[PDB]
Amino acid sequence: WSKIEENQTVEMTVNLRRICSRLPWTKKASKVVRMLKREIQKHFREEIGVVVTNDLNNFLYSRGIKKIPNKVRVRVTKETSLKNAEENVLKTDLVVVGSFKNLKEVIV
RNA sequence: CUGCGUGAGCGGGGGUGGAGGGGCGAUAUGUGCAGAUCUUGGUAGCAGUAACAAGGAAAUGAUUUGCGCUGGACGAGG
């Protein structure tokens, strides 16, 4: 396994078609942002909250309210909570790509 | 809580209560309740059950984006 924290930025691919199956086709887009937040908390074995950028949010709604695009490449980073002062959050952003081939997990 | 009476009922003791209450003889009665699909008021079980609501999101939301189709005027009525 690989659970990663302490001031870094990881890059990662998520399979939306996979994590959103078992959901009715009228509800895959209406609940897609909430299914993605659960799977980042599982990937890193965390408990803190997740924050989604306005470009990630806009990209998950770009096939209408019935379709849900296939894959997404994201960049995760941990920093301080803007609502409390002692807790952290996982902040996620969008990375634009033309292919998903040979793309592994990266750390900088 | 306790004594007496075959019984209907009648006494005493300790708390509570804060102003009146009885015995005996004759007399006047709107004079004794378990029931009337009785009258009025209060309360259980059923049961936290049936039914109804939880509208797409973005730490923030005068900014960004997703969905629905009545929209604007005169009279009656308010």
| Cα atoms found within 13 Å of the Cα of residue A11, Cβ hemisphere only | 11
- Pairwise CA distance, residues A73 & A54, whole Å: 15
Q: Which of A104, A76, A79 is nearest to A3 (CA)?
A: A76
* Secondary structure of residue A89 in the 3-state scheme: strand
Cβ pair A100, A64 in contact under 8 A: no
Q: Which amino acid is at A11?
A: E
Instruction: Using the structure, give the distance in angstroms from the CA atom of A36 to the C1' atom of B33, rounded to a whole number.
Output: 76
Say whether the CB atom of A35 is under 7 angstroms from strand B.
no
According to the entry, how was the structure determined? Answer: cryo-EM
Instruction: Using the structure, give the distance in angstroms from the CA atom of A97 to the C1' atom of B21, rounded to a whole number.
Output: 103
- Pairwise CA distance, residues A99 & A26, whole Å: 28
- Pairwise CA distance, residues A67 & A27, whole Å: 10
What are the Cα distances from residue A68, in Å, to A24, A45, A50, A53, A107? 12, 26, 20, 18, 27
Q: Which amino acid is at A81?
A: S
Resolution of this entry, Å = 2.7
Say whether the CB atom of A86 is under 7 angstroms from strand B.
no
